[PDB]
Each structure stands twice: as C-alpha cells, then as structure tokens.
Design a protein around this nucleic acid. Sequence first.
RNA 1: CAUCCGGUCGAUCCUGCCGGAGCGCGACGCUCUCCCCAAGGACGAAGCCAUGCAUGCCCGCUCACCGGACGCGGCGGACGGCUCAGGACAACGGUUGCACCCCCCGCGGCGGUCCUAGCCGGACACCGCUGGCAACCCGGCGCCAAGACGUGCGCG
RNA 2: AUCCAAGGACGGCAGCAGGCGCGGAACUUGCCCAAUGCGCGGCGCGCGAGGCAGCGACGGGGAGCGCGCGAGCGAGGCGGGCCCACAGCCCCCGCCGCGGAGCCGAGGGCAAGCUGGUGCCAGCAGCCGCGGUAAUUCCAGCUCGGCGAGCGUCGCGCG
Lengths: 122, 164, 138, 258
Amino acid sequence: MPEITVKVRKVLNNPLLQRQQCVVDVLHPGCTYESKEAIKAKVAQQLDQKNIVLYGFKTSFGGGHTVGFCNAYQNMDALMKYEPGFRKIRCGLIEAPKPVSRKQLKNLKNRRLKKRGTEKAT
Amino acid sequence: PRISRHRNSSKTYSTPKKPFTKPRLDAELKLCGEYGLKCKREIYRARYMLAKIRRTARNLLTLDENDIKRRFEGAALLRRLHMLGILDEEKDQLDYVLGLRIEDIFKRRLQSVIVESKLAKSVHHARNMIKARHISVGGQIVNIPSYMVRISNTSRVAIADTSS
Amino acid sequence: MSKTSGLYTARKLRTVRRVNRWADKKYRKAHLGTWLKANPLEGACMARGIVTQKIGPNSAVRKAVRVQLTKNSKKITAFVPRDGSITYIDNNDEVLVAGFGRAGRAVGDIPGCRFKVIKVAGIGLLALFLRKREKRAR
Amino acid sequence: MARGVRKHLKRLNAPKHWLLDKMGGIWAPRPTNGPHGLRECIPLILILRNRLHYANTYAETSMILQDKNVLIDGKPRTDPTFPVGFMDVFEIPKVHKTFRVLYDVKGRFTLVPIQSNEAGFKLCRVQKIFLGDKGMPYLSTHDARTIRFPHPDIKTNDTIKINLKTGKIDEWYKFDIGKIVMVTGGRNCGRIGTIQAIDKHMGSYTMIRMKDTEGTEFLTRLCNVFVIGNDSPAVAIPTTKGIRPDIIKNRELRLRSI
RNA sequence: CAUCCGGUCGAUCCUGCCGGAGCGCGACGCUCUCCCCAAGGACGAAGCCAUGCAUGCCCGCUCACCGGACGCGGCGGACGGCUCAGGACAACGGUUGCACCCCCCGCGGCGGUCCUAGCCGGACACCGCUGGCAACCCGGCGCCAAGACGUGCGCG
RNA sequence: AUCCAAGGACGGCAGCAGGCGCGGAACUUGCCCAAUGCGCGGCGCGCGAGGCAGCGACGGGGAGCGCGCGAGCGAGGCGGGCCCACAGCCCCCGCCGCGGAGCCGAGGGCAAGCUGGUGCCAGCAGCCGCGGUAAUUCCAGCUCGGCGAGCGUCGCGCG
Ligand SMILES: [Mg+2]
Ligand SMILES: [Mg+2]
C-alpha cells in the first residue's frame, strides 16, 4: 500500500466568511485513497477535523493524480451560517427532510388562489 | 436558448476530387501498410494539416523579410514545427517548410516512436499494446495510437509502471 | 472594343448582364417561375398519391401506373422499376412517388415518364423485392 | 420597439474588457444607474468574485455586501451591481487592503494598492459649467457629482481634487500643454503622455496630440483625455508607466513567464 | 487546395449541348460494437385547441386564531419567452443633431412657501348578523388602522 | 368555441409539455431553483427564463471486431468511491468475463471476370447502349473492387 501525500495550494484567508480557501492535491500512485473522510486528517494537519468540507474532487486519466478543494472554518457556527444546505446534507451534520414534489405545491397554490376570503380549508 | 448552441465544431479532413486513380490507390495502400493506418481518413487528416501549414508558409513568404507580421508569424510557425519534431532543428528559413511531406507527420506518431526504440516488434503489435494501455508518456499513460509526441518528450516515453 | 470599357460605365455593364442572363435555358427554368407552377411536385423531393389504373428500337413493354396526387389533385404517370414488382401494386392503393435521375426530362426509352415508385403501403419497394419486408398486412 | 427600459443583459452583448467567459452562462449582471455608465464602469460582483476570488457565487457576494464589509469612497454600498469606475477608492478595512481603480496599458480595469496619505481623496474631471436655479453657478464631473459656488478660475476639462471626508475642492490642475495626462478611452486606453498640440476644428471634435516618455506619439479626441497632475502624476500609477509593448515584446514576455 | 472524361461520322477537325466525376442542406431505404459533442413542427395551415403549469415579494397598518391567517398599502408585472403574417425611397446598417424633446429606479446636490401642531377629520377593506343565484357574481346593517384619503402650522 | 337548473355566463397556446388537421418532413403531457440572471427583500421566497435528465443514424470527433506461438485485452455483469438539488453518465478500485460489417458495383466514362437459366420476352440502362441460343450488361452461384459504422436513392445551391 503506497503512502498517500496531500499538499496545500492557493492558500487564501477569508476572515469575512471566517474560513480559508483551498485546493487539495492527493497523490496515490498505483493505489486508491479510500475516500475523502480518511483523507481529512492530512489536510487538517497540513493547515478540529469536523470543520472542513471537501466538495471538489476529480480523478485524472490513469488514476495517478486526484485534485480538489477544501474549506476550513474557524468555528462550527460559521460553517452553519455559511454553507449550502445540500453540502450539509452530504456531510454528516443535519438531517434531510423527505422530498415533496413541486407539482403538488403548484397545484395547491393555484387551488388556494382560486378560493376567496378564508381559503385555509384546501 | 441553450448554452450548447454556441459550441463550435468543424471537419478535419478532405476527400479527393478524383476518387479512382490507380497510382493514388497504390500509394495509399503502401502508406497504410508501412504505418499501419486503420482507414483512409488518417491520410486525409494528414493532408489537411500539411495544406494548412503550406498555405501559412506561402502567405508569409509572399511578403518582405523585414515585415513585422512576417517575422512574428514565421517565428511562431518555426517554433511550433521545431517543438513538434516535424522539421529538423538545423533548419530555420521559411523556405524549407514548403518541401515537407506527410511521411514526416506520420513518423512522429506514438506507434512509430515506440517501434523505432525497439520496444515493439511491429506497428501492428504497437497498436495492439497501445489499445491495451501498456505504454506511458512521462508519468501518464496514453491509449490513443494517433497521439503525437514532442521532441522533449521522446526520451521520457517508457512502459507503463502498472502494466503487467 | 465590342464591350464598353470606360471608367464610369458600371451601370451599362450591370444592365447588359441583367438583360442577357435571361437567354440561358437553365437560368430561365430556375428563376422564371413557370416551371415551379407547372411542376406537379411543387418543388418537393417526392409526393404521395393514390393508384387508379395499372397500365403498360428496343421493343420492350414497360409496366407503369396512373397516380393522382393528394395535395394537388392532378394526374401523372409513374413507372415501377424492379422485375415482377407490379404484383405488389394493387388498384386503388396509396403510393409514394419520386423523380427520375433527370429533373423534369424523361429517362431512357420510356416515353413521357418522369416519376418513380419507391414505397407502397408504407414499405419500401426495393426492400420487398429482396424479401426483407412482407405485405401480409395487405 | 420595446415598451420600456431594459433590465437584462446577455453575456455575449456585454463589454469586451470585462473578460467574461463565453460559456459561463446565458446572462451577465446588469449594472444599475450611478456615478458611472454602462460602457465606462464594472459591476462590484465581478471584482468581488472573478478577481479577488473572495466569493464563489452570487449569494456569498450579497451576504458580504449586506454585512457592509466594502467601502466605496467612504460610503458602504450593499448593491451587488453598483458600478465602479476610474479613479475610485476601494478599501476593505477588515483585511487592511486599499486599492484605486485605474486602467492598464492593455485597456482594462485594475486595482492599484495605495497608502493612507493619498486614500482620502479622488480626482474628478469637470465636463460642464451651468447655471442652476436662481442663477447660482454649478459644475459637474465624470462621476455624476455637482458642486456649488466654485472658483471662477476653474474651466471645462480641468481636473479637480475633492476630499472624500467632506467633499470640498482643495486644488485644481489647468488643461494646458506640457501637463501629464492619461487616456481613458479608445484604442489608447491606459497610456500616459504629455500634451504637445491642441487642434480645434469648428463644429466638430477637438484633437489632442501627446508624446509618450519613450518618444512615441499618438492622437486622441479631447473627450477622453484626463489630466492626472502637473509634469509628474499626483496619484500612484501601475508598475509600468503607461508603456504599451509591441506584439513581439509581449510574446517574449509570455514565453519568459512560461 | 489554377485537372477534366463519354456521345453527331464510312473515317477526320470544330462549334454546340446532353451525361459523369466533388462539396453542403433536407427526405426515403438497408444496416448499426463502445465513448464525447450536438440540431430538433420554419418550408404558400400567423390553421384549430381538451388537460396541467408559466408573476410574485414585503419593510408600513394586528383587540383574528395563539405572535403566523386574511385584508388595506407599497414595488413589480411595459423585462423575459414565441413567431416572421404584414410592410419594398419603409424597416435596416453606418454617420449627424435636438439652439424643436420626454424620462422610473439609482448617484450627487438642493432644501427660505403671502393671506388643535404634546399631533386634526370621515370613511371602506378583512370580520359579525342577515340574504339572493344552477354557476359566474354580489346585496343591506354594524364598532375599528394607517408610511391610505382629505384639510393643513410654514422666512414670496 | 364552451356551461346552462334556458332566465343567463364565458374564451383566445405565433409561452412549456401535449392533441387534431396538413404535409415528403420534425421529441417527454419528466425533476429542480443547486449554478447564470431578474423581481421583491436582511440571514430568503418565486421564476416551464434557465439548468438536469429522457427520445434522437440532422450532423461532427475518437477507438474496435486482434497480435503471435502465449500471453494479454476489451464490451458486458456484480460491489465500493467520485460526481449529482436527487438520480444518472464519465473517471478510479476489486471479482467474473460474447469479439458481432454492411451498402453499392465488375462493357466504357470508372477500380473490379467463370458456370446455370431466359431468349427483343422478362428485364437492365443518369449517357453510349444490352437482350432475337456463349448475353463480359437481365435473373442466380463463385470470385473480385470501392467506402466503411456507415452506404445508396430523390430535389435544391456552388463548382
Ligand atoms: Mg398660507
Ligand atoms: Mg394565450
């Protein structure tokens, strides 16, 4: 199992959003990193292990090189305020509500617009 | 509308005006055999590229030597040719370009460069191994037979490390 | 010479060419409009009609059919190419009819024939000739 | 014939010097009305997203602007489509970065970091002297700013130094031969030179001839000639002193950087 | 990326046309192993349309129910999307001008108003009671709010 | 053109899907506001604009149906990643493993020839022409030629 190296590039400080910009390059010649979770540690020591988000990740032809982006937040709350919901759902942070079809929502909206005065019955 | 409408596209080859010509058929079959060409579209592609280079060289040559545009474009074209290995290093005058031939283009294909290094028995064997991803350029593996290698990359071609 | 050549004579040359380009038969046919109105196909590659009558230095009787175009209601004559293909054509049947090699003029020793049958009842005639498709639905 | 004003902007119809990518999307931001017009400005979001890379999307830029983290001439602006223009002040206190918006030799907007000694003012070009209500004299500038009761010695096409804190003139530069200028439009945008001739044609445009420091000479109309001090520039300028290289020299630079 | 070939005669040289040889746009036929990109009811029917969707948001005004409904008010709906009927010194393209012009938002200024102001007056909407009509639609009585309406203190 | 409890009421898809008619000719009555933008707004809502997916031999680009005396490699199948608003697809890691060519033509223009039938009949033939007992041209078998996942036919434009 050949070792795996993670580097840090394009380091930028973003105090406005209370995080750091990132581009992660992971080298696993002749092998595959298990996934992003097992590689969080390398980026963490290079730069709390739960305040990092990896979202960009593409493996080039041949499998030798894989590159991506990370996002390290100063605090947990900053992550909560500044983060797309689907990213949180992909991460193990919050719980996804059951989806609802937008077609039924539009039907309800039109039916409600049809009624007058108090239209809460339907 | 859809953003996909603004994508460009173009053809890459030219067909002969006279299809049935015995010497042409003989020469094309000969070239296909020496360089192991899959079909006759590759020859048309090579002819297309050669025609483009020749037209650029003609247009540049029609002008005076001390013309800023002539110097600019000739330098660019010569640098490209030297980097790609089509033209020899010792040639730096624009005249030598017009005498080029498609054989020079063919000789820089991946199959040819691995065969001349003795790493393959024949062009057909080279193609068979290339399709089976057993070759690598620098640190990356290329499975396209028509891939064109550059002069600085000729010595960095080897067998794939992971190849069995 | 026999052509005007002065530096300020563009108008005369323009009008001369305009007038004299009408003497070419092909150009007249293409850009006069009479052919467009006369052509039963009305500029289309091929049309659809209905069969109404099967009929017939080389001395070789040829098999053809009379057609009535649906979109135009006029009558024309069409020829059935292959060998023994007349049996596949029945009276009062829908056909698809195209042109011959030459656009308008007659082809070969057939007198006054300029149209070809290619599809019958929604199946290619040539395909039926090779038994690729079959007419058991009809 | 549209029944009213336009609110959208297709990406392909946008100005070239913005450098928007063809396949980025169908639409482009439409700047709102303000100090600078559509063809001599640039939206704030482009700077905040496609240049400094501090934001990756529209929403991030909107959040940042709402938090009032960006100042434009000392006044916080919350509009993602606010137009930014020439000789503006762009200071972000939370990261101690202050820039002045200028033109590069290639003819594009640039951010030149500045010092505090010169970041409390801006230079304005006066384009109009008119009498307002009650006969009170006025003046207007290229950034849509009107001043009352100005000095009579100030005429058209001059340059004015106004303090941002208050908004009062302190000194002005006359338009004359031998004064360093900067070109703000046309084929010669971003060049620096000195006026050498002024030729006026009755009933039509006035032509200005200036010489570059190296010795080059070029022509432009008076509508886009901006005085930036006497002999020497009053403000900071990009690293290159308004010298446009030739194609060959630029190709050599590109090859060196590669 | 400067090319021609077969056909009038017992044979030959010309004029002259017929046909072939290339590319592109569509339709038809036969056939189709893998991947990437990608057009798609325009073609003398701008012919006719079941069914669903395509324009909302909110600072102002809470004695509603437990503050969220609803309603008044404000901004927007004149942008976007579809098609090419009409129209031939017109539309349109480049080049001028308004010392014959109008202009919301936004930015910057400016802000002197002749003859109860510890803060004025009356209404409707929602809602309660009472009703017509197959549906669509509304009626009559009744207390209440305003960044709504009306009046208006003020250095011509 | 629609409803009517006959006195009355009511509509404008050349918007997105979809249906009829017409024609030689042209797709799902799908998911989403996550990206680009617009509208109104403070920690967001809405958008058939737009995006994603589906049908799709209009069309364009890249690989293959073997190489050699043994191995190897794909397509494909089953799982894990990555991506995705959610799902795919590409790409990567493991185990097992379907190698499938058609369309035109062989007198000339124009590259490519032997048997059996038919007998100016049937048929071929863009043009010249073939066919009335060897048919180098029809119908079939063998062999061969061109392009090739494409080939051929019809109409138009340029040459
Ligand atoms: Mg008064
Ligand atoms: Mg409508």
